[PDB]
Each structure stands twice: as structure tokens, then as C-alpha cells.
Scaffold this motif. Structure first.
Motif, short mmCIF file in Angstrom:
data_model
loop_
_atom_site.label_atom_id
_atom_site.label_comp_id
_atom_site.label_asym_id
_atom_site.label_seq_id
_atom_site.Cartn_x
_atom_site.Cartn_y
_atom_site.Cartn_z
N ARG A 32 0.71 -1.21 0.00
CA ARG A 32 0.00 0.00 0.00
C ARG A 32 0.75 1.29 0.00
O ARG A 32 1.89 1.37 0.42
CB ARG A 32 -0.80 -0.07 1.30
CG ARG A 32 -0.21 0.79 2.39
CD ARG A 32 -1.03 0.86 3.69
NE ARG A 32 -1.44 -0.45 4.17
CZ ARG A 32 -2.69 -0.78 4.53
NH1 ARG A 32 -3.69 0.09 4.55
NH2 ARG A 32 -2.94 -2.04 4.92
N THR A 63 -4.14 -2.26 -1.09
CA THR A 63 -4.57 -3.00 -2.24
C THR A 63 -5.68 -3.89 -1.65
O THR A 63 -5.40 -4.59 -0.68
CB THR A 63 -3.46 -3.89 -2.81
OG1 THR A 63 -2.52 -3.10 -3.53
CG2 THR A 63 -4.07 -4.90 -3.77
N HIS A 102 -5.15 -7.14 2.25
CA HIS A 102 -4.65 -5.86 2.71
C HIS A 102 -3.97 -5.97 4.08
O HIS A 102 -3.34 -5.03 4.54
CB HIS A 102 -5.77 -4.80 2.78
CG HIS A 102 -6.85 -5.25 3.71
ND1 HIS A 102 -7.65 -6.36 3.44
CD2 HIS A 102 -7.24 -4.73 4.90
CE1 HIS A 102 -8.50 -6.50 4.46
NE2 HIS A 102 -8.26 -5.53 5.36
N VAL A 140 1.29 -6.55 -7.62
CA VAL A 140 0.85 -5.19 -7.77
C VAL A 140 2.09 -4.34 -7.84
O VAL A 140 2.97 -4.43 -6.95
CB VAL A 140 0.08 -4.74 -6.55
CG1 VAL A 140 -0.39 -3.29 -6.80
CG2 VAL A 140 -1.09 -5.69 -6.35
N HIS A 142 3.64 -0.68 -7.96
CA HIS A 142 3.47 0.73 -7.73
C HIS A 142 4.71 1.39 -8.32
O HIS A 142 5.84 1.02 -8.01
CB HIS A 142 3.42 1.09 -6.22
CG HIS A 142 2.17 0.67 -5.50
ND1 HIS A 142 0.95 1.27 -5.74
CD2 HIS A 142 1.97 -0.27 -4.53
CE1 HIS A 142 0.05 0.70 -4.95
NE2 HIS A 142 0.63 -0.25 -4.22
N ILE A 152 -0.30 2.29 -10.79
CA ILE A 152 -0.53 0.97 -10.20
C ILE A 152 -0.90 0.00 -11.31
O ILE A 152 -1.82 0.21 -12.09
CB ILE A 152 -1.70 0.94 -9.24
CG1 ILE A 152 -1.73 2.24 -8.47
CG2 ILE A 152 -1.60 -0.28 -8.31
CD1 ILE A 152 -2.92 2.30 -7.52
N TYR A 154 -1.66 -4.03 -11.99
CA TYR A 154 -1.96 -5.33 -11.42
C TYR A 154 -1.90 -6.48 -12.39
O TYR A 154 -2.30 -6.40 -13.54
CB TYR A 154 -3.41 -5.39 -10.93
CG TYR A 154 -3.82 -4.23 -10.06
CD1 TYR A 154 -3.99 -2.93 -10.55
CD2 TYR A 154 -4.07 -4.46 -8.70
CE1 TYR A 154 -4.34 -1.88 -9.70
CE2 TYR A 154 -4.45 -3.43 -7.84
CZ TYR A 154 -4.58 -2.13 -8.34
OH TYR A 154 -4.97 -1.13 -7.48
N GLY A 168 -7.35 -0.05 -5.53
CA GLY A 168 -6.41 0.66 -4.66
C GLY A 168 -7.26 1.56 -3.78
O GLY A 168 -8.15 2.26 -4.25
#
Ligand SMILES: OC[C@H]1O[C@@H](O)[C@H](O)[C@@H](O)[C@@H]1O
Ligand code: NA
Lengths: 339, 346
Positions: A32, A63, A102, A140, A142, A152, A154, A168
């Protein structure tokens, strides 16, 4: 420059400072975004340690998935078969169920490309995890670049037919202070329709509604207070906004939305068809961010994904992911400063 | 003292030095032990980075579960119901299935008690992961003290009736070199019986056999070479040792096993009923440990747990875990010097 440090509980904090002096930081806990700052001001909401997220609110900047949003009765049908997912909000499956992705420590690797730096986080969702068929190998990415573009990306692959539609969960606050409402912000959004909620359970109502010329029409930049002072039953139902907006034109090239406050603006781009907008309608809760008590409306999200509710409104799309198929998604948050 | 650093891929390396100068280290990747040294000698097998574990062999020193070992056809019966778990070794479910707990980054907290330091790793197995009812909140505490005792304490609670019987996958090699066989080590083990495996699939045969006075009898200390050189069927089936030994006397107080090489001994204490022993029967696989090619028999584990096969041999135990009921298991490895006279040549 790149800096890595202990973020607490074994999690790491990865901070990237680009050519412009802009700083973005992430953590492997939930892949995150933790902070995003300019000239010493934060643009998004976040805590100062992993514990906070775990004790206060695990969602901010994470995420979320495998399926983002609420699924009525936690029920999905896969290959004509009914599957019941973990139910963590009444009978609904919300954001993948309890203790989801998460809240996990993802592995990661940093890749410095000079003008751009990438951080690729990876996690395996075992087959059967929270009712979801798998295994699902996910990643993921970033990245942040010299143009102030935070992107971002995925990717996922499943061993079995399953469902997949992550998002997100960053919350923006151009005020740089949680005790301040985003109502002073201006929003523009290329959506002429929205998905109304049934009731306080927040499941979809069943239909698609046209927002053209309502307090929710942001096709033309407007201040949030508008939507916020509205008497639309839908605004009144959630106490602000908490809905999927259907983008009019699809494609990663189009600026789907724009959040502006003074000379500072955020543009949103995605290859997704919808944007779920939530205005931190927490009322009195007062979650503390940087020792600042959060206010009702002290934040706003842009959750790009396929609209929740496709289980009831197929027109929304289809979140299935077939065995062997490679899922891909991209969302971009671009920062700009006026002159 | 305590030191922490990045170990790779996001994992950390937590290193402890006790008052005696002995160092030991762990990683949150699989709540695993990475190394244990005395006077610069590795007492165990381990790699130098997290990526090695993921690329070469993910088991060494790991915490494995939720169920350690092989479950024939991945079938378990939980409160009258049949449940099928992830099958990752043919129709077998080995060490909790694919991409199990040993492969995950656990969160952890360190507690400094002075003469003792504890590293508590935590993880949640979600309900349905790899077919197991949960969710299961697990924690593993590895601790090291001024007396050279390395202790592993397991704890767990499930939301649902499930199964649980984890273990620690450390491999010892007192030679401090993977390329050196442990056949030169002395072994003492308080067990009169063992569980034979059916065949190459390695599921249990169905019976419990008495090993007294055979080449597998180590009640009285003997060189491992005796076992290795044996032509007993069971030895030949697995090319070494890879079986559960039923402890004769239970209890955390009893020295169940003792591994010696010259002036160094490792003593084993546990509150579990069996010790599964596997002697790195890898043939010429030659996995590289610290640039040394590992040899067949270049290591030995003492996996303390309820014996595998209880599905077929009820007498072995019951690994079920009732919802809300707290699981605990404690295993201890203690290091000694000049405990005995071990002066041999191979
Ligand atoms: O990869 C290590 C594995 O090797 C197999 O031959 C053994 O029987 C397993 O118990 C062991 O954990
Ligand atoms: Na860390």
C-alpha cells in the motif's frame, strides 16, 4: 532517491523521491501507499506505523481484493456453481472478507529505472482462501516517476476459474490535514451514470441511474459542497458519496477524473470502467491521522475497478477470471501544480 | 544483543548473541531459523538470503503446517466430516499443501527479557486456505537464552473445528559443512518403535514396529553410519532415515534425543509424542549451502510432532483442534559442550 526502513511488525517502508523533490512511500503490508507529499504537505491520508493501520483502519491506501466492494450474501457463481465467500459485514463479503490481502505482508522487489522506480509486490492467495478458488498468484506494481505520475499495475493468474477485481484504496486530502473537509475541493468526473445503493446495507439497489443534471453531475468541475449539501435521497442515504460511477468513455488515455484544490490538482486515469467514490462519511468517529482528528468528509477515494453489484446487474460487467487467463489492470494518479 | 536487517524480498534477519557469545538467527519468511553458530561454526544448515530459500529449498529451518508430514490422499475427517486438503505431492497433502506457511512473510515482534530474547512471529491462516477450516490465528515464538537453549513455542486458535500439528524443519550438521555427511555423528534416541512407510509414496504402512536391537535402535548412543549402512528394507526404501520414531516416555523434562560430534552435543526436549527423522537422503541433488555442495546424508532433522499417519493409525494420536480451543506445543534444542566423550573416526 530510494530509502527503505522498518515500518513496524516486520513491515517495510519504501520511500521514493523523484527529480522534483516529490516523495511517495509504500509498505509491503497490504502493498500500500502510505504517504505522498509535496513541499512538506501530504496529499493523501496515512498513518505513521504499521500498527496504526492494524489498530485504526486497515483500508487506507491498501490493495483490496480479491474482489473490491460488497458482494450480496457473499455469493458468486463460478462456472454455474454457487460459491459462498467469507462474510465479514453481515452476510456480505466486503473487500475480500476478513483478514484479506490488505492485512498480509507481501514480498517485494524494487527496480530503479532512473526517471522511474518500480516496486513490485507479490502474494499468493491459496486455493480456498476465504472461499475463493485458486491458487491466485498476484502482483501489484506501484511506480513513481519524474513526471509525478504514480501508477498501479496489477497482474494475476489463477490455477482455477475464479473471480478477480481488486482496487487501490488511497484517500486523498489536498488540505493535507484530516481535520479538514474535502468539501472545498473541486471535482470533475467523466461519468453520466451511477449505481444507486439499496439501503444502509450498501448493497446495490438493482438499477442504473442517469446523473445528468443532478447534484452528482461532475461532468463539469464543481465543488464537493454541492454534492454534500444535496437532498438526493442517495446522498442522504450514506451521508455524502459512496457509489460507483460509470465512466462514459473507456481507455487509459482519457483523464477520467480530476481533483483540484488551489494550484494543486490530481488527475485520474484507468483502464477500468468504473470509479467507486467514497467521501469518508465517518461522522464523529474521529480516526486520528498524524495526531489529527478525522472529520466526516475528511477524505475521498477513487477506487477504479469493475462496479460492485455485477452479481445483480450483469450489465456492469463480469469479474470472472478463468484458469490460465492473465488478469491485468492499470490506474494512474498524476499530480500537477499550477503556475 | 539483537540486530536486524533486510534479508531479501522484504524479509528480515533477526540476529541474537547471548552472553556466551553464541549467535543464532531467524527470518520472518516461514518463521524460520537461519543459522546457529558456535565459535564461527554453523551447527545447522541454512542459506544466505531469502531468495535462496525460495529458489533452492523452502523447507530448511522452517515452521511447517498446519499439518506436518503426509496425509494420504489429502483426506481428513473433521467432526464427522470428510475434508479434502490441497494435494501437492501426488494425491498427498505434504506439509500443509502448496505455498504453505513456510513460504509466507509472518509479522513479528521482539521481546527482550535480558537473559532471554523472544521473537514472536504471527500469521493467520484464513478459513478454507489449502482446504483447512479456519480461520486459524497462529504464532510461533522462537527464543534464545544465556544457557544456549533454543526454544520453539507454538500457539494457535481456530474459529472452526480443524486440524493442527505443525513442526520445525531444522537440519543439523555438526560438521558445519553441508558437503560432510552426518554419519560420523553419534545419535541417542529414547524410542523403541517406529512407523514404517508403505512404499516410495511414503505414506504409512499401517503398522507399528518394534526396532529394538535392530540397526534403528539408538536407545544407547551409536554412530549414524550404522543406520546408513543398514540393509533393512525400511532403510533401503528411503535410502536412509525418513520415519517417525515413537518416544517411549513423554514429557518436556526428558532428554529425548541427543546428537553429538566430538565435543558438541545438541539435546532435544519436546512435549510431542514422536520425532520424525529425515537424513537428507537427497542422493546427488547437491543443493549448494554456503557454496558447499550438499551430500547425501548431509543433514538430519528432529521434527517433533504428533506422528504422521494418525489418519490410518488412530493409536498415533488425534490432531484435531476444536474451535475456540487453544493449541500449544513446545520443543527445545539445547547446545552443550563436552557433555560426553565422543572420539571416533570414519
Ligand atoms: O524437500 C524436503 C522433503 O523431502 C522429502 O523426500 C521428504 O520426505 C520430506 O519430508 C522433506 O520435507
Ligand atoms: Na522488515
Amino acid at each position: 532517491s530510494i530509502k527503505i526502513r522498518d515500518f513496524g511488525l516486520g513491515s517495510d517502508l519504501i520511500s521514493l523521491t523523484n527529480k522534483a523533490g516529490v516523495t511517495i512511500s509504500f509498505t509491503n503490508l497490504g502493498a500500500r501507499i502510505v504517504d505522498w507529499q509535496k513541499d512538506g504537505k501530504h496529499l493523501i491520508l496515512g498513518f505513521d506505523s504499521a500498527k496504526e493501520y492494524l489498530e485504526k483502519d486497515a483500508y487506507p491506501g491498501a490493495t483490496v481484493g480479491p474482489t473490491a466492494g460488497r458482494i450480496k450474501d457473499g455469493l458468486v457463481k463460478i462456472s454455474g456453481k454457487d460459491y459462498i465467500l467469507n462474510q465479514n459485514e453481515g452476510p456480505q463479503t466486503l473487500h475480500g472478507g476478513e483478514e484479506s490481502i490488505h492485512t498480509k505482508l507481501w514480498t517485494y522487489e524494487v527496480t530503479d529505472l532512473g526517471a522511474e522506480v518500480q516496486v513490485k509486490f507479490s502474494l499468493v492467495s491459496n486455493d480456498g482462501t476465504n472461499g475463493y478458488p485458486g491458487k491466485i498468484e498476484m502482483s501489484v506494481t506501484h511506480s513513481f516517476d519524474d513526471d509525478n505520475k504514480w501508477k498501479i499495475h496489477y497482474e494475476a493468474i489463477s490455477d482455477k476459474d475464479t473471480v478477480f477485481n481488486p482496487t487501490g484504496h488511497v484517500y486523498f486530502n489536498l488540505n493535507g490535514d484530516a481535520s479538514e473537509s474535502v468539501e472545498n475541493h473541486g471535482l470533475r468526473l467523466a461519468a453520466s451514470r451511477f449505481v444507486p445503493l439499496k439501503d444502509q446495507t450498501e448493497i446495490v439497489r438493482g438499477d442504473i441511474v442517469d446523473i445528468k443534471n443532478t447534484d452528482l453531475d461532475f461532468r463539469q468541475e464543481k465543488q464537493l459542497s454541492n454534492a454534500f449539501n444535496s437532498n438526493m435521497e442517495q446522498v442522504q442515504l450514506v451521508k455524502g458519496i459512496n457509489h460507483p460511477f460509470l465512466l462514459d468513455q473507456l481507455g487509459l488515455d482519457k483523464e477520467q477524473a480530476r481533483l483540484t484544490l488551489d494550484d494543486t490538482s490530481i488527475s485520474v486515469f484507468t483502464d477500468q470502467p468504473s470509479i467507486v467514490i467514497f467521501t469518508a462519511n465517518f461522522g464523529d468517529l474521529g480516526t486520528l491521522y498524524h495526531e489529527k482528528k478525522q472529520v466526516h468528509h475528511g477524505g475521498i477515494t477513487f477506487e477504479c475497478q469493475v462496479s460492485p453489484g455485477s452479481e445483480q446487474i450483469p450489465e456492469l460487467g463480469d469479474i470472472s477470471l478463468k484458469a490460465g487467463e492473465k488478469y491485468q489492470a492499470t490506474t494512474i494518479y498524476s499530480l500537477h501544480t499550477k503556475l
